[PDB]
Amino acid sequence: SEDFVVTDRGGIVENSHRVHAAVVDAKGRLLYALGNPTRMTLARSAAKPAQALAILETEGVAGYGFDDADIALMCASHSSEDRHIARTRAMLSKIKAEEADLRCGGHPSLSEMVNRSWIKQDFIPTAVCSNCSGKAVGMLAGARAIGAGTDGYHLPDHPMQGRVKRTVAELCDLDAGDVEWGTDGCNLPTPAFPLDRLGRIYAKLASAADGSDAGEGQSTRCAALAHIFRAMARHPEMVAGEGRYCTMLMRAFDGALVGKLGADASYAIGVRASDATRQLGTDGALGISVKIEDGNLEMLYAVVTELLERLGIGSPDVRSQLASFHHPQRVNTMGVTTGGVSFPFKLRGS
Amino acid sequence: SEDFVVTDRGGIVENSHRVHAAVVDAKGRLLYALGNPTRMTLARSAAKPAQALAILETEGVAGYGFDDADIALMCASHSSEDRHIARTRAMLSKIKAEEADLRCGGHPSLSEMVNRSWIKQDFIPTAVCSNCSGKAVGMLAGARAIGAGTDGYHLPDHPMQGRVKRTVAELCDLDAGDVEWGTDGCNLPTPAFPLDRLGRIYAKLASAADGSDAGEGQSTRCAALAHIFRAMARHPEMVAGEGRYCTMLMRAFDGALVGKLGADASYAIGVRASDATRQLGTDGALGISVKIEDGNLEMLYAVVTELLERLGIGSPDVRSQLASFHHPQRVNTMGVTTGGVSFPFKLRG
Ligand SMILES: [Cl-]
Ligand SMILES: [Zn+2]
Ligand SMILES: [Zn+2]
């Protein structure tokens, strides 16, 4: 319950960060934990697959012809690379909308390399550049498809947001009153719920992929969840971008899992059934959710990668692709290694 | 104890950050605390006034003619503004040295506005651009004055670093073995010691300033501490830069205190004796030191400003120049405020 990731300088403690984590089975039963696995947590962008489900289940959205890469962008916190802007624009054209219809705003890119190119060009990002631009187009598409107004598609009382709110609570297996709502950076409602339920959503994503693969009689919702999983795993560069953790993680695993960042250092992973998950004592898919209490992203990726190693998910060779995130560099202005990162926590079985 | 600073989104907890703080008198006695006031803590750049004391006490350094603004730069984590870089180069000429003699490296500017300008220009920062460049020149100056060699002035076995290590321990009133050492971003040794002792250093700085102003006879060390305090308070723009917390804090207080940032979210302040310090129960100067356990700088500045308010240091008018740091903006991409910062901590005496 007192689980930390700790950085040091010469073996002297620099910073410490409290970790919360839940590892759950396909029905949401808690298998392993760090910290408080039920911590009430703002899922932020890690809720995007659930919002994408609400979009995909909206009557008429199928008629726009969104493809897997478009769905991956709905699920993205992308780096605002030119390819992400181009896909956003292509999605707007599918619904006969324009950039002025977006209700999210521009921001500095999540990628330092993109941001430096923008600074060099004096480029001011606009709505089409938002990391949430794919979700925004999807919400616009849903509003248009049912003949709702589009001007306020992001407002809490709009029917698209009522659909989102209902869909999030159903995927979490929670009553409406057990999900709290704030406003996100992109100006949409954003949910908070117990951390283990974030893992449950991702377990359900990977379980649906397994059941699609196995040729089971799936509900339309399970079919849609399987589609979302497949889309993210097939187009992981749309979900984040070059050099980004989510993209590198999903590329290394080549369809065995999906992963997604939430702002302020949450992370979620859906893991398809494998020899590794069977060794962990479950017969189906699993979900992992993590929150770093103080919000540090570098520590989040270090911890997530350490957790994958402790859980035996992947091979050493596969996980070696994430080495730069697992043990972040601590090299000073003269090339000297001054410190490191340590994981003095123990996963508890529960 | 459970002392935190917390951010929320619509009243829903986002992040929480553990706070440690010590408020000490001029002899280091603990008056108030948050968290663990004796946490072993890397002082990082908050140690720079102690390193500047080691430089200024090196025999021969007075002959180079460093002025108060040069001393303030020795005490700095500057933003690498053109005035900082230029002063570093001017300081090198005072000691007949070149940039190739420095043993620190460049890095992206601590100021976003400066760094944006560098990106637009394809500027590559070099040693004189380091936020620690003034300290580096001072260490090189002391090595030149000693006469034993300058190539390794930054190495632990060099007499300049032996002087630094002894001086830090003496100011903390610690045995050498109770101060631990790592290596800083600039490649110099950097000390760790209990957090309250960082407060003690800054209490001694302010106390020396009080004695000097009152005309008391002082030891050579106290006279040098008073000089460091004066230099920081007279040239706060050299200590950090435009828009930076340390500069805005020291300007607002107009000589009543000095403050300094350490990397990974430590902060130290030395407060000259005043009605406010007397209300806190001490008859001399005060020191304050703070560490945010997880290293978040935005939260550090919010907590330091909140602590000054709780201690009654300044006036609402003086502290209001720090309002942007006290309650950081939480405005989204559409201009809407989405939450804020709160301070569920409780000072203990
Ligand atoms: Cl594409
Ligand atoms: Zn968003
Ligand atoms: Zn330094």
Residue numbers in the entry:
A (entry chain A): 4 to 353
B (entry chain B): 4 to 352
What does the article say, verbatim?
Asparaginases (EC 3.5.1.1), which split L-asparagine to L-aspartate and ammonia, are grouped into three unrelated structural classes: Class 1 (bacterial-type), Class 2 (plant-type), and Class 3 (Rhizobium etli-type). ReAV is a homodimer with an α/β protomeric fold, formed by two tightly packed domains. The active site of the enzyme is located in a cleft on the protomer surface and marked by a zinc ion with an unusual coordination sphere created by Cys135, Lys138, Cys189, and a water molecule. The conspicuous catalytic center of the enzyme comprises two Ser-Lys tandems (Ser48-Lys51 and Ser80-Lys263), centered around the curiously hydrated Ser48 residue and located in the close vicinity of the metal binding site.
The substitution of His139 by alanine does not affect the conformation of the neighboring residues: just two water molecules, marking the sites of the two N atoms of the imidazole ring, fill the available space left by the histidine side chain, maintaining the original pattern of hydrogen bonds in the active site area. The fully occupied Zn2+ binding site is conserved in the mutant structure, as are the catalytic Ser-Lys tandems. In the close vicinity of the Ser48 hydroxyl, high difference electron density peaks were detected, previously also observed in the WT protein structure and interpreted as three closely spaced water molecules. The crystal structure of ReAV H139A shows alternative conformations of Asp187 in protein chain B. The major rotamer of Asp187 (refined occupancy 0.7) is rotated toward the side chain of Arg47, forming an H-bond to its Nε atom, as well as to the water molecule from the zinc coordination sphere and the Oγ atom of Thr341. Interestingly, the H139A mutant matches the WT form in kcat (445 s−1 vs. 416 s−1), but its substrate specificity is reduced more than twice (5.6 mM vs. 2.7 mM). Intriguingly, the side chain of Cys249 did not undergo oxidative modification in the H139A mutant structure either, in contrast to what had been observed previously when the zinc cation was present in the WT protein structure.
